[PDB]
Structure 1
Amino acid sequence: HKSEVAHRFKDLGEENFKALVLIAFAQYLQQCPFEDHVKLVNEVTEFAKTCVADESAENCDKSLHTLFGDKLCTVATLRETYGEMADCCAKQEPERNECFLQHKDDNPNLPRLVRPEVDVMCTAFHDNEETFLKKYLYEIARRHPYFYAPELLFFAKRYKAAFTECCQAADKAACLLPKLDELRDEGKASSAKQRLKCASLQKFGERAFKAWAVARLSQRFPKAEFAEVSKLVTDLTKVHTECCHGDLLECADDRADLAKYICENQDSISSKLKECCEKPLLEKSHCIAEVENDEMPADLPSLAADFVESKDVCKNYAEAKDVFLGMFLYEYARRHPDYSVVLLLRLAKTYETTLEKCCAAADPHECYAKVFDEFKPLVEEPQNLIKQNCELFEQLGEYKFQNALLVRYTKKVPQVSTPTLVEVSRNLGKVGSKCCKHPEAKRMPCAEDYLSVVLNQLCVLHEKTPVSDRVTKCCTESLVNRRPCFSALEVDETYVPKEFNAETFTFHADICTLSEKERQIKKQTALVELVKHKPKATKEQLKAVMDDFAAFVEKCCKADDKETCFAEEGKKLVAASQAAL
């Protein structure tokens, strides 16, 4: 088409166009105030409308990069506020956009965003829904300049729906709060997944990413042909490489192209793509990215034939190693949607290590004839951990389950900071209440998805202020061995317990007037400090002390007079506990 802006404006729609332009500007000019951004959006939109009316109006022929760049260079304070970024304006567009990209700040220093009271939000929402939502949209985008724009818009729409619903209810707070917490967690998870995807692509390379995608796409589109799966994995790798570089326009066009390619060859890929392919341009790719697994052929051959029993295995493998291994991944993954992708990768790595050794020996067949027996122990490991932990989560509840994990991990890595241990254990706890509800067939994929982010949040932090070689080890190993590594950590027999600290175990009545989450976190913090002081303590000793603390807290919060009870009975509890331990 003769005009880029006009075309985009047309298939996006005015409302979507406006929100996206706002996000795009906020991610580049992270320091400019809201009023200035709104002003820019209005000018770009007004210009866009001119081009819609006549693709021949002036400047309507300019590319989007050029137009975006020219408007960015119009900001008068560009130099005084962003300094060096202002020098990007002296370059020819091609280089200009690259320069702006290089100067995008990922971890800016903006005040943390505080959640106001439910009634102020609801009142604000009713008085001016537009400015309320757009201002928060701006606040979120300036803080996450890397978050893929269209997905942020998808989140905004869900927030709107939460206010619309809850702000017109009897008990607003009881309605809205849980929705906001779920949205935030989900928002943070999405952010982590995006960063993880790019970092892994940079650290481990294209081959590893391609294997990961082959496995994932084969579980989802089992009826698709291997050649079709390879086509998709290739385009998908290119798409993420570009999206990770950070250029929104390039990223968006590649994704769109891929989404249409998929819809046009729908019948040749999966019968589950029907809905996704009838959705508007903006939602297509997102929908496809979450499509459920198509059902498998059910009348499929045995893997043993072509990969163990067959003659010429070594011959087909030597002829094209990666293609053969990819074929193996494809065949194995499409018969196992119940496996995590990383498990499939372990199987593949194991099959590769075996052919490398075995294909160089006299009688190949004999050497690699028992490969499938090496797979069994690899499979069972995550499966046992699932049942074992989910059952426990069932006996106890989410809270006591978190406490169980708390005792378990403080003992393995007592060096870690107490707030980190609490944070991590609580998140692990949630993965349990969220995945253990799924039937066995969907548990591993679920746990893998959530554990990948929790483990990455854990590693990133630790990276900053490292405290344990073991954690560093597990954090730097391959993403395939990451979870196994942590699971293999044993109690720290070297750790020297921390001296007693009266303060740490002193409690007041203010705990009675705290919110549930707040009470738990204070108790859990104490629970971690206890284990750090008495690491050799037993599950029984510990249970007894946690129970005394329990009755104690209920007793002191249920008395004609508090504070005294906590101080008087607190003296007791502490002294007794010490002796018992």
Structure 2
Amino acid sequence: HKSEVAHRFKDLGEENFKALVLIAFAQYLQQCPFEDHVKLVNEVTEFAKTCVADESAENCDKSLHTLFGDKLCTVEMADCCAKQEPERNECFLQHKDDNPNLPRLVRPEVDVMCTAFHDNEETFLKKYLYEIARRHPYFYAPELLFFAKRYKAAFTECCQAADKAACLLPKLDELRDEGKASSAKQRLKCASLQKFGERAFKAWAVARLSQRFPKAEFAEVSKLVTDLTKVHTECCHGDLLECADDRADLAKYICENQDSISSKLKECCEKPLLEKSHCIAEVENDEMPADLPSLAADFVESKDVCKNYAEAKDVFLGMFLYEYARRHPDYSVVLLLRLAKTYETTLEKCCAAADPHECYAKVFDEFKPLVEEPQNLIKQNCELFEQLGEYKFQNALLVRYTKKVPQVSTPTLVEVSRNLGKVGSKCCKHPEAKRMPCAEDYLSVVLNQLCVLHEKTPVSDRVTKCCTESLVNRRPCFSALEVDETYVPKEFNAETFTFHADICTLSEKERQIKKQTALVELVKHKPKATKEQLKAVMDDFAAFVEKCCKADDKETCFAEEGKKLVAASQAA
């Protein structure tokens, strides 16, 4: 590398460069309007084109953070812009806002959108990136490019359809659902790297890829872990151009040699660049090879265990996890990492003592309770889900987690508990030998969100403990939280329980959030009421809404009949 800017302009290409730069600025300055970033991205692009012509031109020598940050600083920001590199980039990164409280964007009419798509395609698609990047500062940048590709394809197709709204809206809504999920899933990776370190990510990545590619050798898996670690490190540090290039190259590497890795990549490697990576990242598990011995020979019984461990602890323990993860796709990543830490801690205390086998021989016995514990949670909560349904299952978990940590803000409790309820719809449909991976690694994402949303405004000593103590053990920690006894009941507030005619016109998603926001506030006001008791109060609520939405005058029904609800409720 002689001049870093131009180099990335050739590798990635103008379309992707411009995109990735727009995403970079959007994530760092989330409050600034669209027209400002467009001007900055344009000026970097035009600048990069001079460096392509001449790598010896003025300022092309500078680093990408310097080039990016100087350009943002022509525009929170005033704090960071006082600084030099690299502390400025750390500032910018610290200043990322998870819930920026931008308005949930209202979509124009489909006829209006398809006009602007044809008349100004470049603008229309640029504004998509902008708006998603702004609300999801931790979004996997190369992924978001693929989202833009899908979003583009949607209009090319549905704008030339007989019915446009019937074509377009279910595609765009489906796409927004994936976005939120991807975003949350990626927010975990960054949190893992940034709060727990590069070992956490490396250990995570060994487990996940070993499960995925069991016919791959250890040395082959360890390479893909190094490459995948680098890619997310760079993406989570704001090196978006370098992340996307390195990710692209890890995809060409894999696809070149599927034989060394897996048999499931036949279809993925016959796809466009953006879609290619997505496919690999989300590929099914390859068939575990049949001729695999017991793990106990090399790792429990052998006479050179402490010898091979002491020679290379991270090599050896990486092999353990490799060997254990490749033959247990039924286990969750985070379950596997507990066992890798259980086996780690055994070898540290016991290689020291002069009787090594006597301790080390009965290690696998320690795993038994760690494997049953998640399986018990999934069997039980999926039972509950299948019995109630998503909405009521959310309502139950809402009561559960509010009773656990009633100090947490109501938007967070409601958003988290709602997303905890979605595990049921995602994972319980699958069979028992494929449930824990789905479920427990989803809960990792959703709990990380509680942690992240809570991190900025900490009001719960329990949530801080469970979030900080161990990345791997979080779900056990949170599950183990019994109902809080210290909590003083919050005093009745008439604004919280005064509802308006607005409720009738809303969506089914939007409607039930409001009702769930009440149910938390009920649990916050009256925490000693049972799960049965509260049902009867929310019963009367729903029927009150129902009759006032069929009213001639809706305004007056919601005001007058509403106060009789709060009177009758507060009594019981």
TM range (shorter): 0.7 to 0.9
Tell whether the 8 Å contact from 2:402 to 2:413 is kept in structure 1 after alignment. Answer: yes
Report how far residue 201 of structure 1 moved: 1.9
**Could you give the per-residue CA deviations for residues 383-412 of structure 1, whole angstroms, max 9, x where no partner exists?**
121121122211112111111111112211
Alpha carbons of structure 1 residues 338 and 510: separation in structure 2 relative to 1, 3 Å: same
Stretch deviating more after TM superposition (255-264 or 554-563) = 554-563
Report how far residue 536 of structure 1 moved: 1.2
Alpha carbons of structure 1 residues 398 and 177: separation in structure 2 relative to 1, 3 Å: farther
The equivalences for 1:348-427 within 5 A come to: 348-427=340-419
Stretch deviating more after TM superposition (149-158 or 169-178) = 169-178
Stretch deviating more after TM superposition (45-54 or 257-266) = 45-54
Report how far residue 329 of structure 1 moved: 0.6
Report how far residue 220 of structure 1 moved: 0.9
Report how far residue 153 of structure 1 moved: 1.6
Report how far residue 518 of structure 1 moved: 3.1
1:65 and 2:57 matched = no
Report how far residue 346 of structure 1 moved: 0.4
Instruction: Give 5+ residue unaligned stretches, structure 2.
Output: none
Tell whether the 8 Å contact from 1:355 to 1:368 is kept in structure 2 after alignment. Answer: yes
Match of 2:459 in 1: 467
Aligned counterparts of 1:90 and 1:564: Cα–Cα separation in 2: 55
Match of 1:138 in 2: 130
Stretch deviating more after TM superposition (16-25 or 292-301) = 16-25
**Could you give the per-residue CA deviations for residues 110-154 of structure 1, whole angstroms, max 9, x where no partner exists?**
877554454533443344333222233344446667645432221
**Could you give the per-residue CA deviations for residues 181-219 of structure 1, whole angstroms, max 9, x where no partner exists?**
443343234334444323322332333322222111111
Q: How many residues align?
A: 572
Report how far residue 571 of structure 1 moved: 5.1
SS in structure 2 opposite 1:170? coil
SS in structure 1 opposite 2:58? coil
The equivalences for 1:315-334 within 5 A come to: 315-334=307-326
Alpha carbons of structure 1 residues 277 and 9: separation in structure 2 relative to 1, 3 Å: farther
SS in structure 2 opposite 1:458? helix
Stretch deviating more after TM superposition (104-113 or 247-256) = 104-113
Tell whether the 8 Å contact from 2:325 to 2:336 is kept in structure 1 after alignment. Answer: yes
Give the aligned CA root-mean-square deviation in angstroms.
4.5
Alpha carbons of structure 1 residues 458 and 24: separation in structure 2 relative to 1, 3 Å: closer
Tell whether the 8 Å contact from 1:101 to 1:247 is kept in structure 2 after alignment. Answer: no
SS in structure 1 opposite 2:367? helix
Tell whether the 8 Å contact from 2:374 to 2:440 is kept in structure 1 after alignment. Answer: no
Alpha carbons of structure 1 residues 123 and 312: separation in structure 2 relative to 1, 3 Å: same
Aligned counterparts of 1:346 and 1:104: Cα–Cα separation in 2: 31
**Could you give the per-residue CA deviations for residues 499-556 of structure 1, whole angstroms, max 9, x where no partner exists?**
3344433445443343323321222122112222221112222233333333343344
Report how far residue 2 of structure 1 moved: 11
Stretch deviating more after TM superposition (315-324 or 330-339) = 315-324
Stretch deviating more after TM superposition (84-93 or 6-15) = 84-93
Instruction: Give 5+ residue unaligned stretches, structure 1.
Output: 76-83
Stretch deviating more after TM superposition (199-208 or 210-219) = 199-208
Tell whether the 8 Å contact from 1:427 to 1:454 is kept in structure 2 after alignment. Answer: yes
Stretch deviating more after TM superposition (431-440 or 111-120) = 111-120
Name the % identity.
Answer: 100
Alpha carbons of structure 1 residues 331 and 489: separation in structure 2 relative to 1, 3 Å: same
Stretch deviating more after TM superposition (354-363 or 523-532) = 354-363
Alpha carbons of structure 1 residues 328 and 199: separation in structure 2 relative to 1, 3 Å: same
Aligned counterparts of 1:498 and 1:451: Cα–Cα separation in 2: 29
Stretch deviating more after TM superposition (21-30 or 123-132) = 21-30
**Could you give the per-residue CA deviations for residues 351-407 of structure 1, whole angstroms, max 9, x where no partner exists?**
122223333445433333332222121112111211211222111121111111111
Report how far residue 287 of structure 1 moved: 3.5
Tell whether the 8 Å contact from 2:24 to 2:238 is kept in structure 1 after alignment. Answer: no
Alpha carbons of structure 1 residues 90 and 566: separation in structure 2 relative to 1, 3 Å: closer
**Could you give the per-residue CA deviations for residues 474-507 of structure 1, whole angstroms, max 9, x where no partner exists?**
1111111111111111111222222334443344
Report how far residue 41 of structure 1 moved: 7.1
Report how far residue 297 of structure 1 moved: 0.5
Report how far residue 88 of structure 1 moved: 13
Alpha carbons of structure 1 residues 572 and 308: separation in structure 2 relative to 1, 3 Å: same
Aligned counterparts of 2:570 and 2:72: Cα–Cα separation in 1: 65
Tell whether the 8 Å contact from 1:11 to 1:281 is kept in structure 2 after alignment. Answer: no
Match of 2:306 in 1: 314
Tell whether the 8 Å contact from 2:138 to 2:190 is kept in structure 1 after alignment. Answer: no
Alpha carbons of structure 1 residues 425 and 335: separation in structure 2 relative to 1, 3 Å: same
Aligned counterparts of 1:309 and 1:217: Cα–Cα separation in 2: 27
Aligned counterparts of 1:552 and 1:90: Cα–Cα separation in 2: 56
TM-score under structure 1 length normalisation: 0.81
